[PDB]
Amino acid sequence: LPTERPSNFFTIQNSPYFAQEKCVGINTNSTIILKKSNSDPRKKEAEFKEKNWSQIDKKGLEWQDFTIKIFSLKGDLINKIQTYLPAFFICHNF
RNA sequence: AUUAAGACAUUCGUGAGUGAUUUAUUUCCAUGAAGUGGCGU
């Protein structure tokens, strides 16, 4: 973990998401750059580059509670949506 | 020399005056920026 990061910046080290593996490494385009630490060999330390953080294709975003608005002039459609909406989100990922 | 001779159906006169090619009509409908890990047993 680089010990200089924005307060909203967090990492999931081992995840099934294996795209964007170049975001941590050697090249200057990487968001987090690993170089061999001084003194002791191995046990490299990481540096956070905010400029590369901005130009990342995908980010893991978690928000507070947010609203979903469904509009329909058909009352029976809305009431059927109300029954199935809690089940729909439980059964699906996005 | 004979109910005869002379006599432009002609003069003046704008097819002109008023008039919105306008009123009504959603470039909209459907659609996952997604899929997958691999090798070092």
Q: Å from A21 (CA) to B11 (C1')? A: 109
Q: Which structure tokens are listed for A16? A: 């099934």
**Residue type at position A39:** S
Structure determination method: cryo-EM
A13 touches strand B (CB under 7 A): no
**Residue type at position A93:** N
Residues 58-77 of A with CB under 7 A from strand B: 58
Q: Which structure tokens are listed for A43? A: 């046990």
Kindly write down the DSSP assignment for every residue of A24-78, as one continuous string. EESSTT-SEEEE--SSSSS--EEEE-HHHHHT-S------S--------S-HHHH
A33, A49 Cβ separation under 8 angstroms: yes
> Which of A48, A64, A51 lies closest to A11 in space, CA to CA?
A48
Nucleotide nearest to A19 (CA to C1'): B37
